[PDB]
Design an enzyme around this catalytic site. Structure first.
Site, PDB file in Angstrom:
ATOM      1  N   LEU A   1       0.817  -1.209   0.000  1.00  0.00           N
ATOM      2  CA  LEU A   1       0.000   0.000   0.000  1.00  0.00           C
ATOM      3  C   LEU A   1       0.848   1.255   0.000  1.00  0.00           C
ATOM      4  CD1 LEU A   1      -2.897  -0.843   2.493  1.00  0.00           C
ATOM      5  CD2 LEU A   1      -3.009  -0.552  -0.004  1.00  0.00           C
TER       6      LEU A   1
ATOM      7  N   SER B   1       5.243   2.626   0.801  1.00  0.00           N
ATOM      8  CA  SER B   1       6.604   2.314   1.198  1.00  0.00           C
ATOM      9  C   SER B   1       7.287   3.591   1.653  1.00  0.00           C
ATOM     10  CB  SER B   1       7.380   1.672   0.045  1.00  0.00           C
ATOM     11  OG  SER B   1       8.407   0.833   0.536  1.00  0.00           O
TER      12      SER B   1
ATOM     13  N   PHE C   1      11.122   4.090   6.661  1.00  0.00           N
ATOM     14  CA  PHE C   1      10.928   3.341   7.892  1.00  0.00           C
ATOM     15  C   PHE C   1      10.513   1.895   7.627  1.00  0.00           C
ATOM     16  CE2 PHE C   1       6.451   2.597   8.038  1.00  0.00           C
ATOM     17  CZ  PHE C   1       5.966   3.500   7.103  1.00  0.00           C
TER      18      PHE C   1
ATOM     19  N   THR D   1       7.340  -0.657   5.373  1.00  0.00           N
ATOM     20  CA  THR D   1       6.311  -0.873   4.372  1.00  0.00           C
ATOM     21  C   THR D   1       4.974  -1.218   5.026  1.00  0.00           C
ATOM     22  OG1 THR D   1       8.024  -1.602   2.849  1.00  0.00           O
ATOM     23  CG2 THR D   1       5.760  -2.175   2.306  1.00  0.00           C
TER      24      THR D   1
ATOM     25  N   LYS E   1       1.635  -2.910   8.901  1.00  0.00           N
ATOM     26  CA  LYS E   1       2.806  -2.048   8.881  1.00  0.00           C
ATOM     27  C   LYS E   1       3.992  -2.815   9.448  1.00  0.00           C
ATOM     28  CE  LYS E   1       3.092   1.880  11.314  1.00  0.00           C
ATOM     29  NZ  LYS E   1       3.121   3.361  11.528  1.00  0.00           N
TER      30      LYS E   1
ATOM     31  N   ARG F   1      -5.287  14.217   5.292  1.00  0.00           N
ATOM     32  CA  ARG F   1      -4.428  13.083   4.951  1.00  0.00           C
ATOM     33  C   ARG F   1      -4.542  11.979   5.998  1.00  0.00           C
ATOM     34  NH1 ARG F   1      -1.126  17.361   6.658  1.00  0.00           N
ATOM     35  NH2 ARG F   1      -0.297  16.917   8.741  1.00  0.00           N
TER      36      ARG F   1
ATOM     37  N   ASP G   1      -3.713   7.469  12.018  1.00  0.00           N
ATOM     38  CA  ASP G   1      -2.396   8.034  12.071  1.00  0.00           C
ATOM     39  C   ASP G   1      -2.077   8.809  13.314  1.00  0.00           C
ATOM     40  OD1 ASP G   1      -0.078   8.824   9.646  1.00  0.00           O
ATOM     41  OD2 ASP G   1      -0.072   9.642  11.669  1.00  0.00           O
TER      42      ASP G   1
HETATM   43  C1  LIG Z   1       4.620   4.075   4.036  1.00  0.00           C
HETATM   44  C2  LIG Z   1       3.977   5.390   4.376  1.00  0.00           C
HETATM   45  C3  LIG Z   1       2.633   5.470   3.626  1.00  0.00           C
HETATM   46  O1  LIG Z   1       2.603   5.462   2.451  1.00  0.00           O
HETATM   47  N1  LIG Z   1       1.370   5.530   4.383  1.00  0.00           N
HETATM   48  C4  LIG Z   1       0.150   5.573   3.603  1.00  0.00           C
HETATM   49  C5  LIG Z   1      -0.134   4.151   3.113  1.00  0.00           C
HETATM   50  C6  LIG Z   1      -0.386   3.167   4.261  1.00  0.00           C
HETATM   51  C7  LIG Z   1      -1.651   3.678   4.955  1.00  0.00           C
HETATM   52  N2  LIG Z   1      -2.204   2.952   6.133  1.00  0.00           N
HETATM   53  C8  LIG Z   1      -1.602   2.957   7.488  1.00  0.00           C
HETATM   54  O2  LIG Z   1      -0.587   3.476   7.714  1.00  0.00           O
HETATM   55  N3  LIG Z   1      -2.280   2.292   8.562  1.00  0.00           N
HETATM   56  C9  LIG Z   1      -1.642   2.332   9.862  1.00  0.00           C
HETATM   57  C10 LIG Z   1      -1.607   3.571  10.563  1.00  0.00           C
HETATM   58  C11 LIG Z   1      -0.997   3.593  11.800  1.00  0.00           C
HETATM   59  C12 LIG Z   1      -0.420   2.402  12.337  1.00  0.00           C
HETATM   60  C13 LIG Z   1      -0.457   1.173  11.602  1.00  0.00           C
HETATM   61  C14 LIG Z   1      -1.063   1.150  10.368  1.00  0.00           C
HETATM   62 CL1  LIG Z   1      -1.173  -0.387   9.396  1.00  0.00          CL
HETATM   63  C15 LIG Z   1      -3.544   1.623   8.393  1.00  0.00           C
HETATM   64  C16 LIG Z   1      -4.147   1.654   6.960  1.00  0.00           C
HETATM   65  C17 LIG Z   1      -5.417   0.981   6.691  1.00  0.00           C
HETATM   66  N4  LIG Z   1      -5.855   1.038   5.436  1.00  0.00           N
HETATM   67  C18 LIG Z   1      -5.187   1.680   4.486  1.00  0.00           C
HETATM   68  N5  LIG Z   1      -5.765   1.675   3.154  1.00  0.00           N
HETATM   69  C19 LIG Z   1      -5.111   2.203   1.867  1.00  0.00           C
HETATM   70  C20 LIG Z   1      -3.914   2.969   1.844  1.00  0.00           C
HETATM   71  C21 LIG Z   1      -3.430   3.419   0.622  1.00  0.00           C
HETATM   72  C22 LIG Z   1      -4.112   3.106  -0.542  1.00  0.00           C
HETATM   73  N6  LIG Z   1      -3.568   3.592  -1.879  1.00  0.00           N
HETATM   74  C23 LIG Z   1      -2.829   2.700  -2.786  1.00  0.00           C
HETATM   75  C24 LIG Z   1      -2.700   3.322  -4.218  1.00  0.00           C
HETATM   76  N7  LIG Z   1      -2.172   4.578  -4.170  1.00  0.00           N
HETATM   77  C25 LIG Z   1      -2.020   5.083  -5.354  1.00  0.00           C
HETATM   78  C26 LIG Z   1      -2.901   5.445  -3.363  1.00  0.00           C
HETATM   79  C27 LIG Z   1      -2.918   4.878  -1.912  1.00  0.00           C
HETATM   80  C28 LIG Z   1      -5.301   2.359  -0.505  1.00  0.00           C
HETATM   81  C29 LIG Z   1      -6.086   2.011  -1.819  1.00  0.00           C
HETATM   82  C30 LIG Z   1      -5.791   1.914   0.709  1.00  0.00           C
HETATM   83  N8  LIG Z   1      -4.015   2.303   4.697  1.00  0.00           N
HETATM   84  C31 LIG Z   1      -3.503   2.278   5.949  1.00  0.00           C
HETATM   85  C32 LIG Z   1      -1.507   5.099   5.493  1.00  0.00           C
HETATM   86  C33 LIG Z   1      -0.933   6.145   4.520  1.00  0.00           C
END
Ligand SMILES: CCC(=O)N[C@H]1CC[C@@H](N2C(=O)N(c3ccccc3Cl)Cc3cnc(Nc4ccc(N5CCN(C)CC5)c(C)c4)nc32)CC1
Length: 300
Positions: free
Chosen positions: A23, A25, A28, A30, A50, A146, A160
């Site tokens: 999702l 990278s 820190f 992925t 994460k 965000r 977040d």
């Molecule tokens: C590496 C830094 C980074 O990039 N962080 C971002 C990605 C990870 C994201 N994230 C968390 O950090 N969570 C979390 C928070 C705190 C502690 C533990 C955790 Cl696990 C729970 C979380 C749950 N669901 C999603 N659903 C989701 C995300 C992105 C996408 N798309 C993919 C296609 N792209 C083009 C557009 C984006 C989609 C389609 C669905 N993202 C999450 C947060 C922001």
């Protein structure tokens, strides 16, 4: 002092979940889209996992445990919740999957199809989530579009809690990287943070939603923001906003923290407007716009 924090922290086996795709990278580590399949329970739970990269770093290990600590501590339909942690050589945090990504990107990607009912419902849901955090004496310190993720277009959740701090029985930050354009004035000057300073950021988050993701004070150096604000200037009225809605944002940006709305009041006011959305946002075209899988919200 405070009441005992009897949250449960669940330790998960690495063999119970599988990583499907990346999702996001970072340096820190992925975050993966995945599935969690607790042994013997006959459920498949969509998750975001994460995982630290090269976690021989003691600072990154301490920070992800603090994050796990915070997320475990909360349970509301409008904040993301932890399913658990896995203590592999590289530590993993397992959260509910929010399939549509952040609301900031969602609002940018779909502006031509977002009606006033969705915008005002989102405002209600964020305010209920923030009101819950305030009940739990938790100051988010980083509310922004965000940091709101989209479970369905009809249901968003705050996430977040990277900077989130639970008040000891205000919170004073040491100097560190900090999002000035979203901050209450007292946070920029005196690094003070409160539920009321969260209200300020809530106003800014609404502004982002109502402008379909415009960047606030675009182009202005963050060094200038504190005096701009002391001069009495604020973000401008978004085109789609009636004065009823803009008035709410403005009240969130009062210098007297105690003069800002309570989240409880924002819930009420945005719910009133959600009952007749086109009276409150003016949007062109508004009228027209794996058998055993279980969402984590139904898994208790
Ligand atoms: C590496 C830094 C980074 O990039 N962080 C971002 C990605 C990870 C994201 N994230 C968390 O950090 N969570 C979390 C928070 C705190 C502690 C533990 C955790 Cl696990 C729970 C979380 C749950 N669901 C999603 N659903 C989701 C995300 C992105 C996408 N798309 C993919 C296609 N792209 C083009 C557009 C984006 C989609 C389609 C669905 N993202 C999450 C947060 C922001």
């Amino acid at each position: 002092g405070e009441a005992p924090n009897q949250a449960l922290l669940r330790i998960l086996k690495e063999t119970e979940f599988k990583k499907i795709k990346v999702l996001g990278s970072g340096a820190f580590g992925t975050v993966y889209k995945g599935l969690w399949i607790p042994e013997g329970e006959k459920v498949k739970i969509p998750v975001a996992i994460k995982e630290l990269r090269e976690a021989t770093s003691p600072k990154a290990n301490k920070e992800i445990l603090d994050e796990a600590y915070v997320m475990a501590s909360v349970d509301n339909p409008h904040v993301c919740r932890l399913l658990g942690i896995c203590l592999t050589s590289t530590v993993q945090l397992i959260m509910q999957l929010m399939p549509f990504g952040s609301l900031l990107d969602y609002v940018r990607e779909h502006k031509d199809n977002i009606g006033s009912q969705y915008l005002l419902n989102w405002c209600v849901q964020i305010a209920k989530g923030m009101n819950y955090l305030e009940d739990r004496r938790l100051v988010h310190r980083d509310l922004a579009a965000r940091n709101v993720l989209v479970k369905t277009p009809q249901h968003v959740k705050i996430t977040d809690f990277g900077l989130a701090k639970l008040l000891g029985a205000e919170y004073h930050a040491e100097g560190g990287k900090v999002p000035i354009k979203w901050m209450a004035l007292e946070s920029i000057l005196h690094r003070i943070y409160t539920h009321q300073s969260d209200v300020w950021s809530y106003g800014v988050t609404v502004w982002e939603l109502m402008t379909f993701g415009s960047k606030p004070y675009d182009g202005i150096p963050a060094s200038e923001i504190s005096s701009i604000l002391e001069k009495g200037e604020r973000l401008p009225q978004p085109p789609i906003c009636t004065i009823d809605v803009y008035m709410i944002m403005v009240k969130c940006w009062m210098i007297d923290a105690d003069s800002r709305p309570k989240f409880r009041e924002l819930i009420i006011e945005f719910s009133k407007m959600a009952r007749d959305p086109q009276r409150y946002l003016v949007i062109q075209g508004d009228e027209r716009m794996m058998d055993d899988v279980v969402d984590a919200d139904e898994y208790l």
